[PDB]
Amino acid sequence: GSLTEDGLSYKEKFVVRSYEVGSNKTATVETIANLLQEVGCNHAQSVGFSATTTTMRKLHLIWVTARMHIEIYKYPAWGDVVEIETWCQSEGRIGTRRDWILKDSVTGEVTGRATSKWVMMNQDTRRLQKVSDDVRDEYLVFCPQEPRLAFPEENNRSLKKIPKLEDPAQYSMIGLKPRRADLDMNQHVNNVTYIGWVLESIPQEIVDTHELQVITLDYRRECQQDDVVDSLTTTTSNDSQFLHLLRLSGDGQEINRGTTLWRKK
Amino acid sequence: GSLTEDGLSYKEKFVVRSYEVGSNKTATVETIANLLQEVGCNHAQSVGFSATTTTMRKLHLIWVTARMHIEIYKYPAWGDVVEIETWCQSEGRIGTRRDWILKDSVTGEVTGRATSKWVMMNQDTRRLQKVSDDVRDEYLVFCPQEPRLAFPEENNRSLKKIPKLEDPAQYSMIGLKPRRADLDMNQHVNNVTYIGWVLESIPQEIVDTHELQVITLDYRRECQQDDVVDSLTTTTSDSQFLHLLRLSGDGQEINRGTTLWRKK
Numbered sequence A: 001g002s003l004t005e006d007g008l009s010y011k012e013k014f015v016v017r018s019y020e021v022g023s024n025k026t027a028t029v030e031t032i033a034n035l036l037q038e039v040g041c042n043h044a045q046s047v048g049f050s051a052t053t054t055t056m057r058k059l060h061l062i063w064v065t066a067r068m069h070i071e072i073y074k075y076p077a078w079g080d081v082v083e084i085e086t087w088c089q090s091e092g093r094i095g096t097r098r099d100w101i102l103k104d105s106v107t108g109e110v111t112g113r114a115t116s117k118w119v120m121m122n123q124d125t126r127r128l129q130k131v132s133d134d135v136r137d138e139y140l141v142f143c144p145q146e147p148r149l150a151f152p153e154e155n156n157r158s159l160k161k162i163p164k165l166e167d168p169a170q171y172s173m174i175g176l177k178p179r180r181a182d183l184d185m186n187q188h189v190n191n192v193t194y195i196g197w198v199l200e201s202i203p204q205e206i207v208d209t210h211e212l213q214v215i216t217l218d219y220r221r222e223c224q225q226d227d228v229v230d231s232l233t234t235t236t237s238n239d240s241q242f243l244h245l246l247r248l249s250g251d252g253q254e255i256n257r258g259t260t261l262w263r264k265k
Numbered sequence B: 001g002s003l004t005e006d007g008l009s010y011k012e013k014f015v016v017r018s019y020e021v022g023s024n025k026t027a028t029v030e031t032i033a034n035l036l037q038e039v040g041c042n043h044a045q046s047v048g049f050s051a052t053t054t055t056m057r058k059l060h061l062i063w064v065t066a067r068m069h070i071e072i073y074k075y076p077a078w079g080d081v082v083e084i085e086t087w088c089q090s091e092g093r094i095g096t097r098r099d100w101i102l103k104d105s106v107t108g109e110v111t112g113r114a115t116s117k118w119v120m121m122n123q124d125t126r127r128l129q130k131v132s133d134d135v136r137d138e139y140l141v142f143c144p145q146e147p148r149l150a151f152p153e154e155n156n157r158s159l160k161k162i163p164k165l166e167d168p169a170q171y172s173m174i175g176l177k178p179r180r181a182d183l184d185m186n187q188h189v190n191n192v193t194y195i196g197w198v199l200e201s202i203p204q205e206i207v208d209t210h211e212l213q214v215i216t217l218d219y220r221r222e223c224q225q226d227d228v229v230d231s232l233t234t235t236t237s238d239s240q241f242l243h244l245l246r247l248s249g250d251g252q253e254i255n256r257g258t259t260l261w262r263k264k
Ligand SMILES: NC(=O)[C@@H](O)C1CCOCC1
Pocket: A033, A034, A036, A037, A040, A065, A068, A098, A116, A191, A192
């Protein structure tokens, strides 16, 4: 991969692997989400990060994902080349945003797009905070100055408020636990794992007859390595919509909430 | 990737990804095993196998992994380029073997090696059988004629008999279940997932102070999408462990194995 000519965005190509595809012989949404995470990581490395700056490290500060929104029009097939372009943007003192555009390498057509909201937090106390001016200036030299949005629309799905699923849930998948493959290099549960856990409570019949078009996921609390999770889903709706909830198996402490939109195959 | 000049083996390079590494910032054994599986699929595609032959499809026959043995000397770091060479071999009517050699792209040094034993079976009845004769012919044109072994030493770790772990196990991880990411394109549990489940019963302290050097795994029965598994481990000793994967209810055996670990 490489930064574009202006140095304000980063591009990388990926060839879809055999174990990365589902029953349709096309990449899963978890494969897509892992690839977005990989291109984001390579973008940070290319401009001297890690995404902590020198000031953030001095104050034990980290960037944390608050929301992830993905819309896929076409899943790349096994063996296809997918090109992803990503960039970051400052959102004042609220936090930062990372956007992605997915394209078919052969045709150049947009096959998907994603946006994520990030908030600043003390690594030890877990206390969120607004962005300091010294930090804001340090990453503004790597972001475009004029707004560049993957989701520019007037009232788009990426910014919609998500409600809390009420008991009883229509569907559920109980006793989900992360294994070592679900942990990143810092022994924290990978953000993509939660996408998988949310989808576990979608019945196999929807999965077999529909394609996932949109997923919006809020991250409220982290699942520890020794925590057990319950995945809850209720139909809110040819299209099918669902409301999701991930909560701890015991006390019922909320860890995630989301919505998915599916279309008939 | 591409087949070598003689067309009897296949090579592919891979750049290690951020989510593919563990605490040591080096690729996990599950990442390694996924890469071997990927180079194996690309080798089959390149010689027209889509690993069923023409006669196997009409007869409802498939190749199934019976044993997987992996020995790693150095795990590639995040960002490194690893080159893997793989080839197949006929083992008479017992079955077939697929071997791999892992190398550092920059130095050309061997950083690991793997071998797998495969058996033939009817995909419906799940009944094993001796390969054939008219099927051996179709495979032998894509394999080297003289023996080429990733593990050539006479009576080596890859061919050792594995015993059954006796209850009570020293360590255990119970209630393991596969999710959709653990399934392949045919809705079967990926063979690499069982490697992960075996390692789940190794205490975090061994993982934090040792590096996995060798793993040998026997595949006895498949875990269905709706099955629950218990992972059992006992120290037999470097550190060595004996492993058992069995169904959470009846205790039906699905895998057995051994791992050897070195102090970091
Ligand atoms: N590192 C990242 O960009 C993560 O926060 C994302 C990656 C895509 O899946 C959702 C979480």
